[PDB]
Amino acid sequence: SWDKDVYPEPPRRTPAPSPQTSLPNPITYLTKAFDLLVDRPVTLVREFIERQHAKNKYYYYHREFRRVPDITECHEKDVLCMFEAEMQWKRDYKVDQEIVNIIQERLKACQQREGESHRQNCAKELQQFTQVVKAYQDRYHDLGAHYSARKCLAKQKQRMLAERKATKEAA
């Protein structure tokens, strides 16, 4: 099972079957055969395996990283503090990449699920994708194969200088 808030999904609404004709549809008979011959033995085997798994129980944990000071409060050419800040920045870079992956998966799921009316019913997913892609592009794009926290700090400083000049010339 997963968390239904990070991966949302609307409630399923299926119509009732109305046999207008008198011809028996083979799909109901095939579903009966599938439940008799396939679903029952697989369910029994999984029950046995889960019983074997419940005899001994051990846990694995999600690794927690405490926050260290970032590169903005590191002295220049101070390898210890800069090393810790660089490792933290790389971890957040990986997490941001997977956040963009999550939003992309949401968008693809909406496009497949809504059917032919996807252009109207997937407006919110498109807006979320556009916003998160704009944030990712403003944060991490055009850094090169040798990206580091200093490059990202320089890019953010240049963008902030451009924004300050733009708001000065528009004042």
Partner 1 sequence: MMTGRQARAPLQFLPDEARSLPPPKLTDPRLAYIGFLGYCSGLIDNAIRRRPVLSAGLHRQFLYITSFVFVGYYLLKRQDYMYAVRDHDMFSYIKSHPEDFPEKDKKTYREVFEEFHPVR
Q: At what angle do helices 79-113 and 123-140 cross, to 10 degrees?
A: 160
- The residue among 139 and 155 lying less far from partner 1, judged by its C-beta, is 155
Distance CA 86, CA 126 (A): 33
Q: How many angstroms separate the Cα of 159 from the Cα of each of 146, 154, 156, 164?
A: 20, 9, 5, 9
CB of 143 to partner 1, least distance (A): 6
Residues 149 and 89: beta-carbon distance below 8 Å: yes
Query: Binding residues for partner 1, how many (CB under 8 A)?
Result: 18
Task: Return the sign of the alpha-carbon dihedral for residues 112, 115, 118, 122.
Answer: negative
Stretch that binds partner 1, among 9-17, 33-41, 72-80, 124-132 (CB under 8 A): 72-80
Q: Which residue in the set 71, 100, 107, 109 belongs to the binding site for partner 1 (CB under 8 A)? A: 71
Stretch that binds partner 1, among 98-106, 109-117, 122-130, 145-153 (CB under 8 A): 145-153
- The residue among 41 and 69 lying less far from partner 1, judged by its C-beta, is 69
CB of 132 to partner 1, least distance (A): 21
